[PDB]
Tab-separated table of C-alpha atoms in Angstrom:
chain	number	residue	atom	x	y	z
A	1	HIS	CA	76.593	11.531	-60.855
A	2	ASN	CA	77.889	7.752	-61.110
A	3	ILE	CA	75.396	5.353	-61.261
A	4	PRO	CA	75.956	3.554	-57.641
A	5	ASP	CA	77.250	0.214	-57.787
A	6	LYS	CA	74.400	-1.966	-55.877
A	7	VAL	CA	72.875	-1.103	-59.645
A	8	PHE	CA	75.627	-2.417	-61.833
A	9	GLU	CA	75.320	-5.357	-59.789
A	10	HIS	CA	71.515	-5.788	-60.454
A	11	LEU	CA	71.552	-4.817	-63.500
A	12	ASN	CA	74.153	-7.897	-64.593
A	13	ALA	CA	71.581	-10.148	-62.271
A	14	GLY	CA	69.503	-9.039	-65.125
A	15	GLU	CA	68.096	-12.658	-67.361
A	16	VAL	CA	65.694	-10.555	-69.964
A	17	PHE	CA	64.685	-7.441	-70.112
A	18	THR	CA	66.810	-3.751	-68.026
A	19	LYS	CA	65.706	-0.255	-68.639
A	20	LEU	CA	67.285	3.220	-67.467
A	21	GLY	CA	65.157	6.683	-66.824
A	22	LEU	CA	65.707	10.069	-65.697
A	23	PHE	CA	62.797	12.533	-63.075
A	24	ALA	CA	64.805	14.804	-63.517
A	25	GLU	CA	62.609	17.083	-61.221
A	26	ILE	CA	62.830	15.987	-58.628
A	27	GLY	CA	66.204	14.492	-59.099
A	28	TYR	CA	65.532	10.776	-59.046
A	29	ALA	CA	67.071	8.570	-61.635
A	30	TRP	CA	65.503	4.441	-62.282
A	31	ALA	CA	66.204	1.050	-62.550
A	32	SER	CA	64.765	-2.099	-63.522
A	33	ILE	CA	65.817	-4.714	-64.075
A	34	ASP	CA	62.806	-7.769	-65.182
A	35	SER	CA	59.874	-7.628	-62.883
A	36	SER	CA	62.364	-5.155	-60.210
A	37	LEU	CA	62.639	-1.492	-60.049
A	38	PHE	CA	64.883	0.464	-57.311
A	39	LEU	CA	64.671	4.668	-57.204
A	40	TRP	CA	67.987	6.362	-56.028
A	41	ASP	CA	68.475	10.491	-55.436
A	42	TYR	CA	71.289	11.331	-58.159
A	43	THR	CA	72.753	14.615	-56.467
A	44	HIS	CA	73.303	12.466	-52.800
A	45	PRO	CA	77.012	10.761	-52.891
A	46	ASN	CA	75.933	7.941	-51.441
A	47	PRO	CA	72.484	6.800	-52.258
A	48	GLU	CA	70.162	4.464	-50.484
A	49	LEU	CA	68.155	2.278	-52.273
A	50	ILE	CA	64.457	2.473	-52.906
A	51	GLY	CA	63.220	-0.872	-54.217
A	52	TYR	CA	59.855	-1.621	-54.772
A	53	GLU	CA	60.127	-5.483	-56.117
A	54	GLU	CA	56.349	-6.648	-55.905
A	55	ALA	CA	55.860	-6.256	-59.210
A	56	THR	CA	55.047	-10.782	-60.860
A	57	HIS	CA	55.842	-9.875	-64.265
A	58	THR	CA	58.353	-7.358	-66.148
A	59	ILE	CA	58.474	-3.973	-65.641
A	60	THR	CA	58.340	-2.111	-69.772
A	61	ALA	CA	57.478	1.363	-68.517
A	62	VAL	CA	57.457	3.380	-65.371
A	63	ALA	CA	56.921	7.206	-65.234
A	64	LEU	CA	56.172	10.437	-62.200
A	65	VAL	CA	53.056	11.938	-62.761
A	66	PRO	CA	51.090	14.518	-60.832
A	67	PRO	CA	48.391	13.099	-58.643
A	68	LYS	CA	44.465	13.411	-59.205
A	69	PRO	CA	42.246	15.829	-57.133
A	70	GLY	CA	41.109	14.734	-54.050
A	71	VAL	CA	42.057	11.461	-53.875
A	72	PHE	CA	45.439	11.731	-51.618
A	73	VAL	CA	46.084	13.402	-49.124
A	74	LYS	CA	48.061	15.961	-49.813
A	75	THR	CA	51.504	14.493	-48.443
A	76	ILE	CA	50.911	12.962	-51.853
A	77	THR	CA	53.184	14.904	-54.821
A	78	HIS	CA	53.327	12.545	-57.190
A	79	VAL	CA	51.878	9.063	-58.793
A	80	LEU	CA	54.995	6.505	-59.996
A	81	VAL	CA	52.557	4.737	-62.669
A	82	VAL	CA	54.253	1.192	-63.127
A	83	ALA	CA	53.778	-0.597	-66.038
A	84	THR	CA	54.909	-3.578	-66.133
A	85	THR	CA	53.461	-7.235	-69.421
A	86	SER	CA	51.028	-7.908	-67.305
A	87	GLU	CA	49.417	-5.380	-65.048
A	88	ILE	CA	49.506	-1.729	-64.669
A	89	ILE	CA	50.400	-0.525	-61.098
A	90	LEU	CA	50.159	2.870	-60.012
A	91	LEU	CA	52.019	3.482	-56.126
A	92	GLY	CA	51.471	7.236	-53.377
A	93	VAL	CA	55.228	9.513	-53.556
A	94	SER	CA	55.611	11.617	-51.675
A	95	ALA	CA	59.175	14.353	-52.196
A	96	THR	CA	58.782	16.286	-49.462
A	97	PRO	CA	62.538	18.398	-49.041
A	98	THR	CA	63.581	16.076	-46.126
A	99	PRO	CA	66.482	18.589	-45.669
A	100	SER	CA	69.200	19.771	-47.853
A	101	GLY	CA	69.733	17.701	-51.694
A	102	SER	CA	67.026	15.919	-52.800
A	103	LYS	CA	63.596	14.990	-51.671
A	104	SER	CA	63.455	12.030	-49.953
A	105	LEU	CA	61.518	9.914	-51.104
A	106	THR	CA	58.646	7.393	-48.849
A	107	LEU	CA	56.171	4.963	-51.447
A	108	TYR	CA	52.758	4.282	-50.391
A	109	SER	CA	50.834	1.539	-51.858
A	110	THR	CA	47.013	2.272	-53.675
A	111	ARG	CA	45.234	-1.134	-54.078
A	112	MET	CA	44.919	0.382	-57.706
A	113	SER	CA	45.814	-1.750	-60.475
A	114	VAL	CA	45.062	-2.188	-64.126
A	115	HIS	CA	44.617	-5.945	-66.495
A	116	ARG	CA	47.905	-4.596	-69.107
A	117	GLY	CA	45.693	-5.865	-71.473
A	118	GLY	CA	46.785	-6.610	-75.611
A	119	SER	CA	48.115	-4.199	-76.473
A	120	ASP	CA	52.621	-3.193	-75.032
A	121	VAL	CA	53.218	-0.698	-72.868
A	122	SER	CA	56.645	1.712	-73.078
A	123	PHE	CA	54.950	4.670	-73.053
A	124	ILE	CA	53.082	6.713	-70.496
A	125	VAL	CA	52.732	10.613	-70.338
A	126	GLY	CA	50.887	13.049	-67.525
A	127	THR	CA	49.203	15.693	-67.745
A	128	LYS	CA	48.777	18.842	-64.161
A	129	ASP	CA	45.584	17.596	-63.220
A	130	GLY	CA	46.403	13.926	-63.196
A	131	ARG	CA	44.676	12.542	-66.095
A	132	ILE	CA	46.672	9.164	-67.835
A	133	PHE	CA	47.949	8.721	-70.924
A	134	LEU	CA	49.454	5.318	-72.380
A	135	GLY	CA	51.118	3.610	-75.413
A	136	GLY	CA	53.426	2.055	-76.618
A	137	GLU	CA	54.816	-0.986	-79.036
A	138	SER	CA	52.385	-2.813	-80.499
A	139	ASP	CA	50.490	-0.577	-81.706
A	140	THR	CA	49.211	4.040	-82.415
A	141	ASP	CA	45.763	2.789	-79.701
A	142	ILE	CA	45.925	5.305	-76.862
A	143	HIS	CA	45.376	4.253	-73.344
A	144	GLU	CA	43.561	6.436	-70.214
A	145	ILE	CA	43.866	5.549	-67.015
A	146	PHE	CA	40.996	6.434	-64.691
A	147	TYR	CA	41.148	6.209	-60.539
A	148	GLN	CA	39.057	7.539	-57.911
A	149	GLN	CA	38.445	8.148	-54.576
A	150	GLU	CA	35.625	5.342	-53.219
A	151	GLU	CA	34.589	2.160	-53.682
A	152	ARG	CA	31.279	1.982	-55.795
A	153	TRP	CA	29.347	-1.416	-56.521
A	154	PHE	CA	28.837	-0.525	-60.114
A	155	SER	CA	32.539	1.209	-61.631
A	156	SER	CA	35.885	0.428	-59.756
A	157	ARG	CA	38.360	2.374	-58.194
A	158	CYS	CA	41.076	1.861	-60.953
A	159	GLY	CA	40.279	1.759	-65.147
A	160	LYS	CA	41.322	1.916	-67.971
A	161	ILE	CA	39.336	2.442	-71.019
A	162	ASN	CA	41.025	2.890	-75.271
A	163	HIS	CA	40.336	6.038	-76.460
A	164	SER	CA	41.281	5.711	-80.114
A	165	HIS	CA	39.114	2.078	-81.424
A	166	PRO	CA	40.390	1.099	-84.673
A	167	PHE	CA	37.662	-1.662	-86.956
A	168	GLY	CA	38.998	-4.433	-88.750
A	169	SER	CA	41.132	-4.116	-91.049
A	170	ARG	CA	44.594	-2.949	-89.456
A	171	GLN	CA	48.393	-2.057	-91.347
A	172	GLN	CA	51.083	-2.482	-89.197
A	173	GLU	CA	52.198	1.314	-86.964
A	174	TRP	CA	53.170	1.848	-83.197
A	175	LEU	CA	54.148	4.694	-81.477
A	176	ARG	CA	57.877	5.441	-80.875
A	177	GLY	CA	56.803	8.330	-78.154
A	178	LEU	CA	53.905	10.150	-76.454
A	179	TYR	CA	53.607	14.130	-75.703
A	180	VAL	CA	51.575	15.916	-73.493
A	181	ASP	CA	51.074	19.645	-74.705
A	182	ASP	CA	48.346	21.086	-71.118
A	183	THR	CA	48.704	24.873	-72.991
A	184	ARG	CA	46.153	24.044	-75.134
A	185	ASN	CA	44.568	20.505	-73.968
A	186	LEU	CA	46.591	18.771	-76.560
A	187	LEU	CA	48.443	14.863	-76.489
A	188	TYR	CA	50.376	14.353	-79.092
A	189	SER	CA	51.569	10.698	-80.601
A	190	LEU	CA	54.885	10.139	-83.443
A	191	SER	CA	54.515	6.121	-84.951
A	192	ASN	CA	57.404	5.084	-86.422
A	193	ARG	CA	56.205	5.541	-89.694
A	194	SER	CA	57.556	9.224	-88.778
A	195	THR	CA	52.625	9.980	-88.352
A	196	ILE	CA	51.976	12.642	-86.306
A	197	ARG	CA	49.078	12.257	-84.985
A	198	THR	CA	47.177	14.899	-82.956
A	199	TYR	CA	44.246	14.101	-79.931
A	200	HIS	CA	41.735	16.896	-78.072
A	201	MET	CA	41.017	16.938	-74.312
A	202	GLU	CA	37.775	18.886	-75.219
A	203	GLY	CA	36.317	16.712	-72.253
A	204	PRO	CA	37.410	16.269	-68.415
A	205	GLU	CA	37.463	12.430	-69.539
A	206	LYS	CA	37.431	12.900	-73.099
A	207	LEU	CA	40.215	12.960	-75.774
A	208	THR	CA	39.783	13.299	-79.719
A	209	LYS	CA	42.215	12.331	-82.762
A	210	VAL	CA	41.537	15.736	-84.277
A	211	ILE	CA	45.126	15.541	-86.944
A	212	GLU	CA	46.539	12.440	-88.329
A	213	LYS	CA	49.793	14.129	-90.598
A	214	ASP	CA	52.292	10.940	-92.837
A	215	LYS	CA	55.323	11.819	-93.886
A	216	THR	CA	53.460	12.162	-97.317
A	217	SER	CA	52.062	14.878	-96.049
A	218	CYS	CA	54.806	16.527	-94.665
A	219	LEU	CA	56.940	16.553	-97.957
A	220	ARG	CA	54.180	17.891	-99.846
A	221	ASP	CA	54.671	20.761	-97.442
A	222	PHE	CA	58.251	20.915	-97.109
A	223	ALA	CA	58.121	20.894	-101.534
A	224	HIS	CA	55.622	24.388	-102.033
A	225	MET	CA	58.811	25.379	-99.526
A	226	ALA	CA	61.068	27.427	-101.983
A	227	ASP	CA	64.012	25.238	-100.643
A	228	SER	CA	64.437	21.017	-101.114
A	229	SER	CA	66.621	19.198	-99.715
A	230	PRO	CA	68.787	15.673	-99.680
A	231	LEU	CA	67.992	16.089	-95.854
A	232	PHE	CA	64.995	15.199	-95.783
A	233	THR	CA	62.528	12.613	-97.871
A	234	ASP	CA	60.818	9.800	-97.928
A	235	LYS	CA	63.577	7.356	-96.197
A	236	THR	CA	63.994	10.221	-93.834
A	237	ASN	CA	62.310	8.848	-90.546
A	238	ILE	CA	60.579	11.357	-87.736
A	239	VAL	CA	62.907	10.057	-84.107
A	240	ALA	CA	61.125	13.144	-82.521
A	241	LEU	CA	58.914	15.510	-81.321
A	242	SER	CA	58.855	18.717	-78.721
A	243	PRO	CA	55.937	20.355	-78.510
A	244	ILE	CA	55.739	24.381	-78.180
A	245	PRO	CA	53.253	26.081	-74.888
A	246	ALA	CA	50.437	28.313	-76.561
A	247	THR	CA	52.823	30.705	-74.099
A	248	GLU	CA	55.723	30.672	-76.626
A	249	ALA	CA	53.602	30.555	-80.260
A	250	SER	CA	50.934	31.426	-81.160
A	251	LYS	CA	51.107	29.712	-84.431
A	252	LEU	CA	53.943	27.363	-83.813
A	253	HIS	CA	53.073	23.960	-82.042
A	254	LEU	CA	55.592	21.082	-82.658
A	255	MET	CA	58.691	20.837	-83.493
A	256	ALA	CA	60.089	18.001	-84.887
A	257	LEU	CA	63.248	16.170	-85.639
A	258	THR	CA	64.304	13.964	-88.735
A	259	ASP	CA	67.205	11.936	-88.167
A	260	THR	CA	69.346	14.086	-90.328
A	261	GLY	CA	69.034	16.715	-88.053
A	262	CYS	CA	66.110	19.211	-89.587
A	263	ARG	CA	63.527	20.407	-87.017
A	264	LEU	CA	60.322	21.350	-88.724
A	265	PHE	CA	58.527	23.395	-87.131
A	266	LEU	CA	54.402	22.657	-87.977
A	267	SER	CA	52.045	25.009	-87.704
A	268	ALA	CA	48.710	23.623	-86.130
A	269	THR	CA	45.134	25.949	-86.926
A	270	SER	CA	41.323	25.813	-86.447
A	271	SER	CA	38.956	26.126	-89.219
A	272	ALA	CA	36.699	28.404	-86.480
A	273	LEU	CA	38.980	24.749	-79.209
A	274	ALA	CA	40.656	21.909	-80.946
A	275	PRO	CA	43.453	22.345	-84.227
A	276	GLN	CA	41.901	20.201	-87.344
A	277	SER	CA	44.796	21.690	-89.679
A	278	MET	CA	48.507	20.427	-89.544
A	279	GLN	CA	51.126	22.336	-91.057
A	280	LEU	CA	54.893	22.255	-92.224
A	281	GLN	CA	56.378	26.369	-91.750
A	282	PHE	CA	59.654	26.705	-90.606
A	283	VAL	CA	62.650	24.400	-90.842
A	284	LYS	CA	66.066	24.892	-88.953
A	285	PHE	CA	68.443	22.933	-90.780
A	286	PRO	CA	71.972	21.646	-89.187
A	287	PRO	CA	74.767	23.231	-88.891
A	288	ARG	CA	78.710	22.647	-90.091
A	289	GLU	CA	80.361	22.754	-88.093
A	290	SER	CA	81.478	18.913	-86.434
A	291	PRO	CA	83.653	18.749	-83.054
A	292	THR	CA	87.313	18.876	-83.025
A	293	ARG	CA	89.927	17.896	-80.867
A	294	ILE	CA	92.136	21.359	-82.476
A	295	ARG	CA	91.060	24.489	-82.513
A	296	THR	CA	89.668	25.483	-86.858
A	297	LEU	CA	89.615	28.549	-89.112
A	298	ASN	CA	86.541	29.110	-88.529
A	299	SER	CA	75.507	33.563	-96.071
A	300	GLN	CA	74.128	31.617	-98.081
A	301	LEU	CA	71.587	28.985	-97.245
A	302	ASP	CA	73.135	25.677	-95.939
A	303	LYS	CA	71.055	22.891	-96.699
A	304	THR	CA	72.738	19.287	-97.393
A	305	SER	CA	74.828	19.486	-93.498
A	306	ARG	CA	75.841	15.998	-91.844
A	307	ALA	CA	77.364	16.600	-88.910
A	308	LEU	CA	73.848	15.481	-86.903
A	309	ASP	CA	73.341	12.611	-89.297
A	310	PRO	CA	72.421	10.853	-87.393
A	311	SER	CA	70.106	11.807	-84.963
A	312	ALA	CA	69.011	9.219	-82.675
A	313	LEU	CA	67.720	11.215	-79.467
A	314	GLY	CA	65.938	15.275	-79.063
A	315	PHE	CA	65.217	17.649	-77.247
A	316	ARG	CA	63.890	21.242	-77.026
A	317	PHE	CA	63.031	22.959	-73.908
A	318	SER	CA	61.753	26.611	-73.319
A	319	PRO	CA	62.492	29.265	-74.724
A	320	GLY	CA	64.507	26.752	-77.582
A	321	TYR	CA	67.355	25.311	-75.843
A	322	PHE	CA	67.723	21.865	-77.949
A	323	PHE	CA	70.132	19.100	-77.135
A	324	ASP	CA	70.116	16.431	-80.388
A	325	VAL	CA	72.898	13.581	-79.213
A	326	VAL	CA	74.299	12.818	-82.866
A	327	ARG	CA	75.260	8.677	-82.994
A	328	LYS	CA	77.998	9.587	-85.374
A	329	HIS	CA	79.980	5.748	-84.112
A	330	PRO	CA	78.388	2.795	-82.283
A	331	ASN	CA	79.960	3.765	-79.188
A	332	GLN	CA	80.165	7.422	-78.420
A	333	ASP	CA	77.734	9.760	-79.000
A	334	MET	CA	78.256	13.384	-79.136
A	335	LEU	CA	76.070	16.096	-77.922
A	336	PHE	CA	74.870	18.835	-79.692
A	337	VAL	CA	73.197	21.697	-77.665
A	338	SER	CA	72.427	25.446	-79.413
A	339	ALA	CA	69.685	28.556	-77.616
A	340	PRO	CA	68.837	31.058	-79.750
A	341	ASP	CA	71.032	33.997	-79.763
A	342	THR	CA	69.246	36.475	-77.546
A	343	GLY	CA	71.197	39.056	-78.536
A	344	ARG	CA	71.336	39.023	-81.448
A	345	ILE	CA	67.543	38.103	-82.067
A	346	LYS	CA	66.739	41.182	-79.623
A	347	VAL	CA	69.783	43.542	-81.215
A	348	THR	CA	68.204	43.187	-84.712
A	349	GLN	CA	65.850	45.706	-86.551
A	350	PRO	CA	64.223	45.035	-88.357
A	351	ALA	CA	60.926	42.620	-88.222
A	352	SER	CA	62.119	41.603	-91.136
A	353	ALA	CA	64.827	41.243	-90.466
A	354	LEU	CA	64.488	38.386	-87.120
A	355	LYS	CA	65.877	34.898	-88.454
A	356	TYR	CA	66.211	32.281	-86.379
A	357	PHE	CA	69.878	32.872	-85.223
B	1	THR	CA	84.654	-13.441	-39.025
B	2	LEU	CA	87.948	-15.724	-39.360
B	3	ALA	CA	88.756	-13.614	-42.167
B	4	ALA	CA	89.103	-10.741	-40.277
B	5	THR	CA	90.277	-12.383	-37.079
B	6	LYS	CA	93.691	-13.056	-39.680
B	7	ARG	CA	94.114	-9.215	-41.060
B	8	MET	CA	94.622	-8.923	-35.997
B	9	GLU	CA	96.843	-10.917	-36.102
B	10	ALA	CA	98.509	-10.011	-38.913
B	11	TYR	CA	98.495	-6.278	-37.661
B	12	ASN	CA	99.531	-6.752	-34.481
B	13	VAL	CA	103.297	-9.058	-35.470
B	14	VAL	CA	103.609	-5.167	-37.458
B	15	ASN	CA	102.403	-2.546	-35.537
B	16	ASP	CA	104.325	-4.052	-32.449
B	17	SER	CA	106.992	-4.994	-33.500
B	18	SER	CA	110.508	-3.957	-32.286
B	19	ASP	CA	112.201	-3.277	-35.552
B	20	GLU	CA	111.595	0.264	-35.960
B	21	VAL	CA	113.985	0.035	-38.727
B	22	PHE	CA	110.960	-1.438	-40.537
B	23	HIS	CA	108.616	0.975	-39.241
B	24	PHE	CA	110.107	3.512	-40.902
B	25	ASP	CA	110.386	2.055	-43.852
B	26	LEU	CA	106.419	0.383	-43.583
B	27	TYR	CA	105.021	3.777	-43.102
B	28	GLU	CA	107.103	5.376	-45.539
B	29	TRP	CA	105.078	2.908	-47.500
B	30	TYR	CA	102.053	3.008	-46.907
B	31	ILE	CA	102.145	6.687	-48.368
B	32	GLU	CA	102.611	4.896	-51.326
B	33	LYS	CA	99.948	3.869	-51.488
B	34	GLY	CA	97.940	6.632	-49.834
B	35	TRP	CA	96.713	4.688	-46.828
B	36	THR	CA	96.437	8.257	-45.268
B	37	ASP	CA	93.881	7.267	-42.345
B	38	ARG	CA	96.527	3.957	-41.582
B	39	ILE	CA	99.466	6.091	-40.545
B	40	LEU	CA	97.148	7.724	-37.987
B	41	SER	CA	95.774	4.911	-36.229
B	42	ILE	CA	99.056	4.096	-36.236
B	43	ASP	CA	99.801	4.188	-31.051
B	44	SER	CA	103.220	2.815	-31.381
B	45	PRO	CA	106.151	5.471	-30.317
B	46	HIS	CA	108.280	4.882	-33.507
B	47	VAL	CA	106.009	6.756	-35.867
B	48	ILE	CA	106.524	10.356	-33.936
B	49	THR	CA	109.335	9.681	-34.299
B	50	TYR	CA	109.670	8.877	-38.560
B	51	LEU	CA	106.395	12.031	-39.295
B	52	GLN	CA	109.162	14.287	-36.453
B	53	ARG	CA	112.406	14.003	-38.200
C	1	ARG	CA	66.041	-2.807	-48.637
C	2	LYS	CA	62.369	-3.264	-49.481
C	3	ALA	CA	60.810	-0.117	-49.873
C	4	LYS	CA	58.091	0.501	-46.932
C	5	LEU	CA	54.815	1.761	-48.241
C	6	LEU	CA	52.977	3.011	-46.760
C	7	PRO	CA	49.068	2.452	-46.132
C	8	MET	CA	46.534	3.826	-47.964
C	9	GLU	CA	44.876	5.076	-45.234
C	10	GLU	CA	47.283	8.001	-45.231
C	11	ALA	CA	47.966	8.369	-48.980
C	12	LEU	CA	43.861	9.046	-50.404
C	13	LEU	CA	41.385	11.698	-48.049
C	14	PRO	CA	39.222	12.414	-45.707
D	1	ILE	CA	68.562	23.483	-43.359
D	2	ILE	CA	72.295	24.525	-41.829
D	3	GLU	CA	73.731	25.406	-45.717
D	4	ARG	CA	70.700	28.273	-45.742
D	5	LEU	CA	71.770	29.649	-43.167
D	6	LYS	CA	75.968	29.774	-44.200
D	7	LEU	CA	76.951	30.202	-40.212
D	8	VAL	CA	78.896	26.921	-40.687
D	9	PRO	CA	81.022	26.986	-44.280
D	10	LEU	CA	81.333	23.787	-46.191
D	11	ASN	CA	83.091	24.898	-48.781
D	12	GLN	CA	87.101	25.869	-48.140
D	13	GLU	CA	86.408	29.714	-50.203
D	14	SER	CA	83.959	30.235	-46.890
D	15	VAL	CA	86.160	29.810	-43.783
D	16	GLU	CA	87.320	32.386	-43.825
D	17	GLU	CA	83.810	35.212	-45.076
D	18	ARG	CA	82.620	32.926	-41.151
D	19	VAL	CA	85.199	32.794	-39.505
D	20	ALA	CA	84.744	36.926	-39.314
D	21	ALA	CA	81.230	36.370	-39.382
D	22	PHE	CA	81.339	34.485	-35.598
D	23	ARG	CA	83.143	37.615	-33.962
D	24	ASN	CA	79.935	39.784	-34.161
D	25	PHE	CA	76.970	37.074	-34.007
D	26	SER	CA	75.447	36.836	-30.928
D	27	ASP	CA	76.633	35.495	-27.856
D	28	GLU	CA	73.509	33.631	-27.825
D	29	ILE	CA	74.568	31.754	-31.085
D	30	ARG	CA	78.484	30.461	-30.316
D	31	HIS	CA	76.765	29.236	-27.619
D	32	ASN	CA	75.093	27.238	-29.154
D	33	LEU	CA	77.740	27.065	-31.737
D	34	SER	CA	79.831	23.399	-30.208
D	35	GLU	CA	76.369	21.210	-30.859
D	36	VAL	CA	76.152	22.194	-34.121
D	37	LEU	CA	79.182	21.170	-35.446
D	38	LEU	CA	78.777	18.025	-33.628
D	39	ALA	CA	74.657	17.558	-35.678
D	40	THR	CA	76.661	18.414	-39.018
D	41	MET	CA	79.569	16.589	-38.631
D	42	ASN	CA	77.756	13.489	-37.736
D	43	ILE	CA	75.333	14.386	-40.354
D	44	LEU	CA	77.997	13.912	-43.115
D	45	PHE	CA	79.237	11.403	-41.111
D	46	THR	CA	75.840	8.937	-40.894
D	47	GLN	CA	75.068	10.422	-45.201
D	48	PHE	CA	79.061	8.356	-46.285
D	49	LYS	CA	78.138	4.789	-44.459
D	50	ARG	CA	74.922	5.049	-47.212
D	51	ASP	CA	82.066	11.351	-56.597
D	52	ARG	CA	79.527	12.323	-53.436
D	53	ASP	CA	82.109	10.394	-50.946
D	54	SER	CA	85.118	13.314	-51.530
D	55	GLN	CA	82.663	15.310	-51.309
D	56	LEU	CA	81.317	14.358	-47.888
D	57	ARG	CA	84.998	14.544	-47.434
D	58	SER	CA	85.876	18.080	-48.341
D	59	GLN	CA	82.995	19.478	-46.615
D	60	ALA	CA	84.430	16.776	-43.446
D	61	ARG	CA	87.279	18.810	-43.879
D	62	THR	CA	85.617	22.575	-44.212
D	63	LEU	CA	84.053	22.206	-40.420
D	64	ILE	CA	87.460	20.986	-38.954
D	65	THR	CA	89.758	24.213	-40.091
D	66	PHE	CA	86.544	26.479	-39.057
D	67	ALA	CA	86.505	24.913	-35.735
D	68	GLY	CA	90.210	24.958	-35.305
D	69	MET	CA	90.196	28.804	-35.592
D	70	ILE	CA	87.184	29.156	-33.801
D	71	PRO	CA	87.639	29.898	-29.430
D	72	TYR	CA	84.311	28.580	-28.870
D	73	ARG	CA	82.479	26.322	-25.772
D	74	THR	CA	83.635	23.580	-25.460
D	75	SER	CA	86.608	23.363	-28.195
D	76	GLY	CA	87.974	20.698	-26.774
D	77	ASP	CA	85.759	17.640	-26.712
D	78	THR	CA	84.002	19.137	-29.750
D	79	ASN	CA	87.682	19.894	-32.485
D	80	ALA	CA	88.280	16.539	-31.623
D	81	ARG	CA	85.201	14.509	-31.940
D	82	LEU	CA	84.798	15.952	-34.987
D	83	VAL	CA	88.372	15.253	-36.021
D	84	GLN	CA	87.814	11.013	-35.068
D	85	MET	CA	84.178	11.025	-37.415
D	86	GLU	CA	86.715	12.568	-40.602
D	87	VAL	CA	88.508	9.869	-40.098
D	88	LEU	CA	85.979	6.644	-40.501
D	89	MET	CA	85.233	8.386	-43.446
D	90	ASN	CA	88.514	7.905	-45.088
């Protein structure tokens, strides 16, 4: 589905900042140009632009999140969070299915806005129950937005708190992404230094850091494995995470993607519930075959392949669908996509012969 | 618009002309440009002879 | 076209 | 909604089977076929003014050929209007 021409015009009308994004669960895409926002249904052939230009300052992040229960009328399916350099703005959204292809979409103002504060917002994630978490490229702190139905004299309808609190003595480090796992009430952050932090939503408004695992720990774990490799060193970056839900696995909590194309599967255990320890257990090394125009003529562990070097972006979806954006050239991306060999996995016997085919 | 006026002024000279050898060469050229819906809208009777032949 | 923002009154109950 | 019912074909492949189904559908349905085709056309018609263009164009064609092969109420005025609305699309 080609990007509609009316936003290509707006994109080139940009002065300082533009950004694109996806709302795949309702079939909408979006583009921000400075202090303006535009949504459209990409399944539609001649889409109408749903614009929101009330924003005064440059938009830095937008996300589509479930609403908090008992706050809005039932016809509101989602909440649209719009972060600018000045404010975090909440909008009501109804994506009801009128009537043929995608969900007809309407925006509602809420009179809910918080000062952005000193910390940039580039990453917005939401939970099943409508909790909204924020993070960005100023630091590693995680913020949460509360919002309420009532006007109270002592509180406000809309608030923002910092769940991290650092003291003095700081070091430069910021976030690369935020990741929710509702089945375990966990939140994961990934930093630019490839540090993985795990937070537990112990209570309905509480968030608690329970694990911090830096690259060094991952590398020590990796060293104690029978097979070390040049594809994972202290020079290597972790570019993406993908949580694994509790319904898919008990032990393996998280997958981490290196820029050399290695998938690291990390377990996490309680000492007894939130986890307190995280460990690199299993590595899936890259495939060897590179893409070709002409077909080519087709048992030891291959731990040196560079077919996925460099991996810029990475996504994992249950039950193991893997997408890797390989940026071999500065101009065109190649897409590596794999799935579990379900057939061979269920045929394999006995249990000890099972490999990640 | 005056842009739209100069358009109608132009296509009236074309559609009203009595030179049908010009019309045939014009209909032959409309197809080569993929202007299908243009041929259909023409109400001249020289188009019927071209398409029938 | 600027999207029509329906009011808060409809949005949040009760 | 109309897409689910699989009453009016929208892809050329379904024309053969949809046309056969019309033969044994209750006349209380065949009566309203005229208004259904026009509403569906006017639906595609509106969505066009708002690749996707090819898809609507293809579906527009489908409705016409279906209506062409179906003898029904006010097939004269309806088949003509359907063709005009498809021409404006192009």
